[PDB]
């Protein structure tokens, strides 16, 4: 019931007690592990509110205080009366920071306590959402010196007045299915792009067209907005050695900003809560550029390097992979846009894990997501046993709004 995690490189053993507080379910059973699966009322609400307020008041060293009991009292009254309740600013900030702290798939959690929280609960229309999002983007981007941020729109009431950002990220590139049968742009975004087109977006059918925001306020139909081009910081990708690399015409945006997740705090659900940090290099260079179902540029790069692509055993893919990732890091650094390499990021995470075990009794982590998509075993996280479990406050997946939306 007390669990040990071992690092097989350093032999350091940590003891986890935090998992006992866990409450949501994993998908795993005693007979089957689903560790590699990507997506495995008033009476319901008060114990959730209670659980949360208890941890909040414990965190500020005021557990069992009158202010604690009083707050629990007031929230109780408000749920009985109004069927929901409103978080104090302090609770909202604590909860958002802890949702990130609890994100078992996130390798960048050493930064968790330095999150800028923008309270957008006063927002009522899609134009207001656009304004808050532009401000978030400008704040977070900070001319290349990225700062973590989350913007939190009004919580779910009856599920019929949902605030939703329809985009999966604030900034992404369009994808178009061609008559040539190939894909132009980002293949990941074909369906969403068509939805943008059905709703009136005039697409410029290019390879790197920044998608417009599709914003839904108060359960109303979603409206389109273009993010001011001057607020989307992008980086042309060049290589420090290969002068031909620039000719590939590659670029990427500086700000990774997830906008389709649900933030749960004290049983309250924030269905629109875009959040952003800064990239780890492999996200762009390995996944975005080299995934077969993404930009898939391995072959083109390999050819320009004049590698032997006859046999897999020449490891031409691996060679081209490293160089593409070299170019990404070099390009961001050269343009002074915050980025972290997978070595630095994973080393940071090991330190964070040890900090969390020491000061919290554990750290939920999903090894399948934490180990980077290249060079896994030369990073310290590969050798690190991790326990995965779900704590609240949490970021959760939610269904795409177009499958949900009653137009």
Ligand X SMILES: C[C@H](O)[C@H](O)[C@H]1CNc2nc(N)[nH]c(=O)c2N1
- Catalytic positions, written as ranges: 106, 109, 278, 283
Nearer to ligand X, 13 or 67 (CB): 13
Q: Where does 152-297 have alpha helices with state H?
A: 190-198, 281-282, 289-290
The span from the CA of 361 to the CA of 353, in Å, is 10
Residue with the two structure tokens 């790069």: 301
The span from the CA of 403 to the CA of 202, in Å, is 23
Apex CA 254: angle with CA 127 and CA 342, to 5°? 135
The span from the CA of 99 to the CA of 264, in Å, is 8
Nearer to ligand HEM, 79 or 133 (CB): 133
Partner that binds at residue 169, options ligand HEM, ligand BYV, ligand X, none, CB closer than 5 to 8 Å by kind: ligand BYV
Binding mask 166-185 for ligand BYV (x = CB under 6 A): ---x----------------
Residues contacting 87, CB < 8 A, separation 6+: 95, 265, 266, 268
Binding mask 56-95 for ligand BYV (x = CB under 6 A): ----------------------------------------
Nearer to ligand BYV, 79 or 96 (CB): 96
**Terminal CA-CA length for the chain:** 49
Partner that binds at residue 340, options ligand HEM, Zn ion, ligand BYV, none, CB closer than 5 to 8 Å by kind: ligand HEM
Q: Which residues bind its own copies (CB under 8 A)?
A: 3, 5-6, 8-9, 19, 22, 25-38, 281, 286-287, 290-293, 298, 312-315, 317-319, 321-322, 325-326, 329-330, 333, 341, 343-344, 366-368, 371-378, 382-389
CB 319 within 8 A of CB 349: no
Binding of ligand HEM by 374 (CB under 6 A)? no
Scan residues 133-162 and list those touching ligand HEM (CB under 6 A). Answer: 148, 150
Single residue of 278, 316, 369, 395 touching ligand X by CB under 6 A: 369
Binding of ligand X by 8 (CB under 6 A)? yes
28: number of Cβ within 10 Å: 14
For the bound state, the minimum distance from the C-beta of residue 120 to ligand HEM, rounded and expressed in Å, comes to 15
For the bound state, the minimum distance from the C-beta of residue 195 to ligand HEM, rounded and expressed in Å, comes to 20
Binding of ligand X by 397 (CB under 6 A)? no
Binding of ligand BYV by 134 (CB under 6 A)? no
Q: What is the largest CA-CA distance in the chain?
A: 74
**Upstream peptide bond of 172 is cis (omega within 30 degrees of 0):** no
Buried b (16+ CB within 10 A) or exposed e, 32-65: eeeeeeeeeeeeebbebbeebbebbbeeeeeeee
Torsion sign, CA atoms 347, 352, 357, 362: negative
Q: Where does 60-198 have alpha helices with state H?
A: 66-82, 89-101, 126-141, 190-198
* Number of chain positions touching ligand BYV (CB under 6 A): 11
The span from the CA of 231 to the CA of 228, in Å, is 6
Partner that binds at residue 35, options Zn ion, ligand X, ligand HEM, none, CB closer than 5 to 8 Å by kind: Zn ion
For the bound state, the minimum distance from the C-beta of residue 219 to ligand BYV, rounded and expressed in Å, comes to 25
Is 210 labelled a binding residue? no
Q: Coil, strand, or helix at residue 149?
A: strand
CB 394 within 8 A of CB 265: no
Torsion angle, alpha carbons of 261, 264, 270, 272, to 10: -10
Partner that binds at residue 385, options ligand X, ligand HEM, ligand BYV, none, CB closer than 5 to 8 Å by kind: ligand X
Binding of ligand BYV by 279 (CB under 6 A)? yes
Single residue of 175, 222, 256, 281 touching ligand BYV by CB under 6 A: 256
Binding of ligand BYV by 288 (CB under 6 A)? yes
Partner that binds at residue 27, options its own copies, Zn ion, ligand X, none, CB closer than 5 to 8 Å by kind: its own copies
Is 270 labelled a binding residue? no
The span from the CA of 135 to the CA of 237, in Å, is 27
Is 369 labelled a binding residue? yes
Residues that bind ligand BYV (CB under 6 A): 108, 169, 256, 258, 275-277, 279-280, 283, 288
Residues annotated within the binding site are 36, 106, 169, 278-279, 283, 368-369, 382, 397
Residues annotated within the binding site for heme b are 106, 397
């Amino acid at each position: 019931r007390f669990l040990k995690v071992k690092n097989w490189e350093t032999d350091v053993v940590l003891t986890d007690t935090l998992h006992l507080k866990s409450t949501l379910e994993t998908g795993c059973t005693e007979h089957i592990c689903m560790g590699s699966i990507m997506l495995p009322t008033k009476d319901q609400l008060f114990p959730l509110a209670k659980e949360f307020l208890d941890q909040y008041y414990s965190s500020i060293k005021r557990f069992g205080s009158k202010a604690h009991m009083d707050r629990l009292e007031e929230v109780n009254k408000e749920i009985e009366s109004t069927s929901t309740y409103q978080l104090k600013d302090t609770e909202l900030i604590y909860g958002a920071k802890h949702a990130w702290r609890n994100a078992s798939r996130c390798v960048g959690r050493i930064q968790w306590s330095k999150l800028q929280v923008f309270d957008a609960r006063d927002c009522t229309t899609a134009h207001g959402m656009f304004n808050y999002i532009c401000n978030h983007v400008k704040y977070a981007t900070n001319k290349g010196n990225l700062r973590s941020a989350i913007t939190i729109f009004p919580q779910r009431t009856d599920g019929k007045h949902d605030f939703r950002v329809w985009n999966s990220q604030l900034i992404r590139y369009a994808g178009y299915k061609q008559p040539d049968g190939s894909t132009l742009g980002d293949p990941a975004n074909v369906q969403f792009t068509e939805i943008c087109i059905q709703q009136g977006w005039k697409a410029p059918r290019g390879r790197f067209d920044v998608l417009p925001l599709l914003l839904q306020a108060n359960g109303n139909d979603p409206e389109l907005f273009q993010i001011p081009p001057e607020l989307v910081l992008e980086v042309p990708i060049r290589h420090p050695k290969f002068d031909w690399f620039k000719d590939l015409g590659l670029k990427w945006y500086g700000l990774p900003a997830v906008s389709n997740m649900l933030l749960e705090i004290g049983g309250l659900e924030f269905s629109a809560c875009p959040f952003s940090g800064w990239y780890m290099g492999t996200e762009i260079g390995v996944r975005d550029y080299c995934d077969n179902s993404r930009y898939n540029i391995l072959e083109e790069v390999a050819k320009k390097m004049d590698l032997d692509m006859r046999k897999t055993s020449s490891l031409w893919k691996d060679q081209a992979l490293v160089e593409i990732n070299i170019a990404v890091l070099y390009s961001f650094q050269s343009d002074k846009v915050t980025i972290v390499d997978h070595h630095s990021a994973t080393e940071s995470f090991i330190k964070h894990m040890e900090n969390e075990y020491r000061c919290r009794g554990g750290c939920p982590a999903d090894w399948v997501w934490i180990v980077p998509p290249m060079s896994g075993s030369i990073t310290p996280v590969f050798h690190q046993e991790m326990l995965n479990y779900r704590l609240t406050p949490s970021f959760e997946y939610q269904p795409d709004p177009w499958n949900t939306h009653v137009w």
